[PDB]
């Protein structure tokens, strides 16, 4: 991953670094300047596609999906509320 | 239903109106109203209350009583036989046609329990009606009759409440 706006050359030069790794890595990208309400994390992937009849490294860019993990879920729940004791202790049928 | 009603306001009514021996029809539905509810000690200890002056006056109660004597022992032909014996227009006849059919009742509901087999004579004086008219109820009640030897078969809010209560 990496933080900026639209996607720019500095960001293909570290993508080529990363090809070493794992011959088929991914890249994403946040932008923390958006002014947008929807999600603005972008998924890419790179592609090697000739243009002009030169190979060059461009992106491609990927939609995205929901997934597993009860065990996590439950704390992400807590994590949401951030809602505080009431007069007792709460309740233990409340909590449960 | 009715008859209930019928010994709330009558139970109400010995205390209140006399001077503390009332008349006799009222002692007499009274007797009788024990006798459907099946509490046979109150009606025994209501005769025994009821002085020699309601004796001479009034026979009908003596005899509403009598099947009452029957009820203790537990014999029930006698009880029909008593049934038959006395009658008494208006202030008897209602609750009368209910003792009759609740001891009927008892009596096939009884046999039902008690017996998981029983002479066909015998039950005969338990329901108070001739071999012929039994034999032809049972079968179509879904009861086993056999012949030639002629014997008859009988056949979350509660638990928040206590959550609640423990955790304190």
Known sequence: YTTGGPPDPSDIHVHKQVCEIIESPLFLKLNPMTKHTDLPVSVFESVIDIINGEATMLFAELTYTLATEEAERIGVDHVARMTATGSGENSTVAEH | ?168
């Open chain 2, 1 to 168: 239903f009715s008859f209930k009603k019928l010994l709330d306001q009558c139970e109400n009514q010995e205390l209140e109106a006399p001077g503390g021996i009332a008349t006799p029809p009222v002692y007499g539905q009274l007797l009788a109203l024990y006798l459907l509810h099946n509490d046979m000690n109150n009606a025994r200890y209501l005769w025994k209350r009821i002085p020699p002056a309601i004796k001479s006056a009034n026979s009908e109660l003596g005899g509403i009583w009598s099947v009452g004597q029957r009820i203790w022992q537990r014999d029930f032909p006698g009880i029909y036989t008593t049934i038959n014996a006395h009658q008494w227009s208006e202030t008897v006849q209602p609750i009368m046609e209910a003792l009759r059919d609740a001891t009927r009742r008892r009596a096939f509901a009884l046999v039902s329990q008690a017996y998981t087999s029983i002479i066909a004579d015998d039950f005969a004086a338990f329901v108070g009606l001739p071999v012929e008219e039994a034999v032809k109820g049972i079968l179509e009640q879904g009861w086993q009759a056999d012949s030639t030897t002629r014997m008859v078969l009988p056949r979350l809010a509660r638990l928040t409440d206590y959550v609640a209560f423990l955790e304190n």
